[PDB]
Write a protein that binds this ligand. Structure first.
Ligand SMILES: C[C@H](Nc1ncnc(N)c1C#N)c1nc2ccc(F)cc2c(C(=O)N2CCNCC2)c1-c1ccccc1
Length: 840
């Protein structure tokens, strides 16, 4: 009976039915809330297409993949059992069109993977194909029986506005079970990051109990409280310093004004725009944490719901405002203009964030007018999707549901490919929702239930935060529960196996790490533990979390290692469970405790967004954003990139443990890995592109100044950065004399390959700059939701500079070409300084 819930709790990693840490019924309301959305998508989804989850795209096939074709000819090696016949096919052939061509019912599965080439889309539009064309590989499929939908079967089942009183809250006091100066409470009525009204208590002495018994009357009227308003209660000591915070929605999920006695356990601060500050969750640590005691009282329920001509100077002023970037602050004058010309502004979708930031949300008549304005949103509805613009409306500056819902409206038009690109940060954006049940929450729910791949990643992203965010685990747990109740028994069993496996592996990771105080004569224990796991405890096979097409099989005990590191990560290799796998390659997974890999997920995901941006300008910069999933507290997994070594090690081989750093070694290493000259210059060009990619991407992100035992290269020239969570003079990025000699330059010269590198960099850079807004917002979101450390205005404003906002294109070329030159001017000075730093 309720054994199903026990399953779901183990899958979720948090007890959703628990009510030990609630002061209302919002979470439970949201479970019931999501039942319909879950049922509606579960009932409406095509069961066969959900069983095979064809991964496809409507983006045009890029130039770089077109130029790799032999005139409407892609070869597809089909497999029965023994041999395999090849078939010339047009890029535009549907998989049906190929099946009747081969027959000269069944379906084509990719060899070694849970991936199918099925559906009414041309074969150029399946990702697996575009992947094979990119890396220069042959397309191997198998004539297979379709999977039964049965396997996916789902186990079935007084007006606030008539109230002119000033709002007020009684502060009874604070109590802390264990703590020498004074302390006061600051009560804020918030909407977004905007403080509407503020009041303080008198300072009393900071004893383990402090009582005030004071009515704080606010300047705002009850009628003027907008939905999603937050009573943010804060505690300072003293000169002042913030010690604790908690929040409480003043208008609840049923539109009722919040009333009665509350005892709210509070969050502490580390020794600032952090998403965690926004949460409505209270601290679950009742025993240790500070708490505050309040009383709301007056049942009051909130009701549900000009010409456009102007002077020339004002039109220009307003257009100038509408044009500035998302982090340019609006002045009082700017806001007043936007709002007066409300309806002119409404015609420009790009005005929307700014205009909805010009709304006085603490004034009921103005919010009414704002809603009348959202009634007139034809142009918004008609505009082509700008994700950049849409993401801004979903960030911390917008707490109003109707405003936010129009963002989620635009997201509905995203094809499944693009939801995958933005899914991590859409899931992170749930952190900005005032309520647990939101348009965004349901959007993620339904897109996830509509598609096994979004669903798969949705699970791990949500679970990532449920395992290590007390601030948001409750909300996300509710959402994930909603998902698991509609994903199908097949996936429930998949997910179950994966969690079982990663818990086994993380334990071994944690235990091996305990047995070392940097080397290892006890790689004995590791191999011993892995043998014990593989004997009746680890399953025959499991889906690889960061690449769900791949199923892993038996471990390769002999190939598994621990690193001569401080954090002793594991290096695990598995046999692919799929007998149809044509490769011999193992599946390689690193397990690391010690870094916050949520930071790594975000940077790696932004790198993908960059790649996708580049694809729109027909540029490929061969970035290698390897798989990475954060699975728990300072713990996670990383996709092992095969045939790859660090730059440091290439230097340690032809020099030693010293900074002697020869300019020549990398090219030497490359030359000795390339078998032919055909592949060497291919390697070298692959490296010019890689290097350019990572110089630009890392510069824009402000993570370009790196230790070179944290930059790797494949044996085919593909450079890539690693260890992003690891983050006296500096440098823009890493373009060292070793890299420059592969490009055929030295000290103060130029070359064919180097001139290209600049040519590629400048294109790439200016390319990202065409999506300035999108990047600025993802960067702000990234910091706010994933780096508690780095969330001051100054931190967030780094990317304005790096993307040379306001500058013309030609001037931006001159900026970056200078950045490049700063590296030429520094050579090994920083690298060397890193050696002296990171080795003494
Ligand atoms: C630094 C490198 N990191 C990566 N390697 C491959 N794919 C990746 N995605 C990463 C990352 N991040 C690495 N990680 C290890 C993790 C666990 C472990 F037990 C050993 C690791 C090792 C490591 O020292 N090894 C010893 C040499 N054989 C490879 C494994 C490396 C590493 C690999 C090549 C060159 C230098 C170092």
């Amino acid at each position: 009976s309720q054994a199903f819930q026990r399953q779901l709790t183990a899958l979720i990693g948090y007890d959703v039915t628990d009510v030990s840490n609630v002061h209302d019924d919002e979470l439970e309301f949201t479970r019931r809330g999501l039942v319909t959305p879950r049922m509606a998508e579960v009932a409406s989804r095509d069961p066969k297409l959900y069983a095979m989850h064809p991964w496809v795209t409507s983006k045009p096939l890029p130039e770089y993949l077109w130029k790799k074709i032999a005139n409407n000819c892609i070869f597809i090696v089909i497999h029965r059992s023994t041999t395999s016949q090849t078939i010339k096919v047009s890029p535009d052939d549907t998989p049906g069109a190929i099946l009747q061509s081969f027959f000269t019912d069944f379906v084509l599965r990719v060899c070694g993977r849970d991936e199918y080439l099925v559906g009414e889309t041309p074969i150029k539009n399946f990702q697996w194909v575009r992947h094979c064309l990119k890396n220069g590989e042959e397309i191997h499929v198998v004539l297979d029986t379709p999977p039964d939908p049965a396997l996916d079967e789902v186990r079935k089942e007084v007006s606030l506005w008539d109230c002119d009183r000033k709002f007020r809250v009684k502060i009874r006091g604070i109590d802390i079970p264990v703590l020498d100066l004074t302390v006061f409470v600051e009560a804020n009525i918030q909407h977004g990051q905007q403080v509407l009204c503020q009041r303080r208590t008198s300072p009393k002495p900071f004893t383990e109990e402090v009582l005030w018994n004071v009515w704080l009357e606010f300047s705002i009227k009850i009628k003027d409280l907008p939905k999603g308003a937050l009573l943010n209660l804060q505690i300072y000591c003293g000169k002042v310093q913030l010690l604790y915070y908690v929040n409480l929605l003043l208008i609840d999920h049923r539109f009722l004004l919040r009333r009665g006695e509350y005892v709210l356990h509070m969050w502490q601060i580390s020794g600032s725009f952090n998403a965690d500050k926004l949460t409505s969750a209270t601290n679950p640590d009742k025993e240790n944490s500070m708490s505050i005691s309040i009383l709301l009282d007056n049942p009051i329920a909130l009701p549900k719901h000009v010409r456009a001509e102007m002077p020339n100077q004002l039109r220009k002023q307003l257009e100038a405002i509408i044009a500035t970037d998302p982090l340019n602050p609006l002045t009082a004058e700017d806001k007043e203009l936007l709002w007066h010309f409300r309806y002119e502004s409404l015609k420009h979708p790009k005005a929307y964030p700014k205009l909805f930031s010009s709304v006085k949300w603490g004034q009921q008549e103005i919010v009414a007018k704002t809603y009348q304005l959202l009634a007139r949103r034809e142009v918004w509805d008609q505009s082509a999707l700008d994700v950049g613009l849409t993401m801004q409306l979903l960030d911390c500056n917008f707490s109003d549901e109707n405003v936010r819902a129009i963002a989620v409206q635009k997201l509905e038009s995203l094809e499944d490919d693009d939801v995958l690109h933005y899914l991590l940060q859409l899931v992170q954006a749930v952190k900005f929702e005032p309520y647990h049940d939101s348009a965004l929450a349901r959007f993620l729910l339904k897109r996830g239930l509509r598609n096994k791949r979004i669903g798969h990643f949705l699970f791990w992203f949500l679970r990532s935060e449920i395992a290590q965010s007390r601030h948001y685990q409750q909300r996300f747990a509710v959402i994930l529960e909603a998902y698991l109740r509609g994903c199908g028994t097949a996936m429930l069993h998949d997910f179950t196996q994966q969690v079982q496996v990663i818990e086994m592996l993380q334990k071994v990771t944690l235990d091996i790490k305990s047995l070392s105080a940097v080397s290892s004569q006890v790689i004995s224990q590791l191999k011993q533990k892995l043998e014990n796991l593989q004997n009746s405890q680890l399953p025959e096979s499991f889906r690889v979390p960061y690449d769900p097409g791949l199923k892993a099989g038996a471990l390769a005990i002999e190939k598994c290692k621990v690193m001569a590191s401080k954090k002793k990560p594991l290096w695990l290799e598995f046999k692919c469970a799929d007998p149809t796998a044509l490769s011999n390659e193992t599946i390689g997974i690193i397990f690391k405790h010690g870094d916050d890999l949520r930071q790594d997920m975000l940077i790696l995901q932004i790198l993908r967004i960059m790649e996708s941006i580049w694809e729109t300008e027909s540029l490929d910069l061969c970035l290698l954003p390897y798989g990475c999933i954060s699975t728990g507290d300072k713990i996670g997994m990383i996709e092992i990139v095969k045939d790859a070594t660090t730059i440091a090690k290439i230097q340690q081989s032809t020099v030693g443990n010293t900074g002697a750093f020869k300019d020549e070694v990398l090219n030497h290493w490359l030359k000795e890995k390339s078998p032919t000259e055909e592949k060497f210059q291919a390697a070298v060009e692959r490296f010019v592109y890689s290097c350019a990619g990572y110089c630009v991407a890392t510069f824009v992100l402000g993570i370009g100044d790196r230790h070179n035992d944290n930059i790797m290269i494949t044996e085919t020239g593909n450079l890539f950065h690693i260890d992003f969570g690891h983050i006296k003079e500096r440098v823009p990025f890493v373009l060292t004399p070793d890299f420059l000699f592969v490009m055929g330059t030295s000290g103060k010269k130029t070359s064919p390959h180097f001139q290209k590198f600049q040519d590629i960099c400048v294109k790439a850079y200016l390319a990202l700059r065409h999506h300035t807004n999108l990047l600025i917002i993802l960067f702000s979101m990234m910091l706010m939701t994933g780096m508690p450390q780095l969330t001051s205005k100054e931190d967030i404003e780094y990317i304005r500079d790096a993307l040379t906002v306001g500058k013309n294109e030609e001037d931006a070329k001159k900026y970056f070409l200078d950045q490049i030159e700063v590296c030429r001017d520094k050579g090994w000075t920083v690298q060397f300084n890193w050696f002296l730093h990171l080795v003494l």
